[PDB]
Design a protein around this ligand. Sequence first.
Ligand code: CU
Ligand code: CU
Lengths: 118, 116
Amino acid sequence: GPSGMILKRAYDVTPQKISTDKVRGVRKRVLIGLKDAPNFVMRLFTVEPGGLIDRASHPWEHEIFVLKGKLTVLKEQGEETVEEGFYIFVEPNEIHGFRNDTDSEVEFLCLIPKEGGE
Amino acid sequence: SGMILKRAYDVTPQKISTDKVRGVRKRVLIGLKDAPNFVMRLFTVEPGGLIDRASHPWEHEIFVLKGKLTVLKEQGEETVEEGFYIFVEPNEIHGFRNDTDSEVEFLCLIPKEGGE
Ligand SMILES: [Cu+2]
Ligand SMILES: [Cu+2]
């Protein structure tokens, strides 16, 4: 493929609104997307206060790193909150979701294999 | 289980000190034991630390978490700060240095073919 390196301020990517049956109060920046990625993509999610990524599962994993705030993680059984500096691994097909129960924006990096989209 | 939630700091850093890498610690957050496709590491570069120029047949996806990171390119260099992401194409010459007086941290993901 192509050569070179991209170095860019993540906030120079505009946050795009995500609105689906199971997602509300969320915006996403695609940092390293399908157009460039050999294998996996990098997104930066912003969860607004009260925003919800409701429980779901899908045939690919997540690798997540929490950048800002207190994130509530929804599990098959119950929930647990983590904060900036936590990582999360979600195996393929594992039930998961996220909620922001705080009054300030939560941000996390979320990487998936590119077969799962961007 | 099917979900791991952990404070990255709690993962034991590994000291690296070789002919090409000095003053660097590496945490493997999501490693080969868990990862179906790609691995997640967190590097700490001490003041004056160096990851010297190299290339390899896999990409890097990096996010700068803390500090001012000097990025070595095939020729020359570029400094970036916390809040920058870096995509290094496969085979591109790259490395890293910390010219500041405090620790620099960055997240670094590679496909599993690259090891952890
Ligand atoms: Cu998901
Ligand atoms: Cu490298």
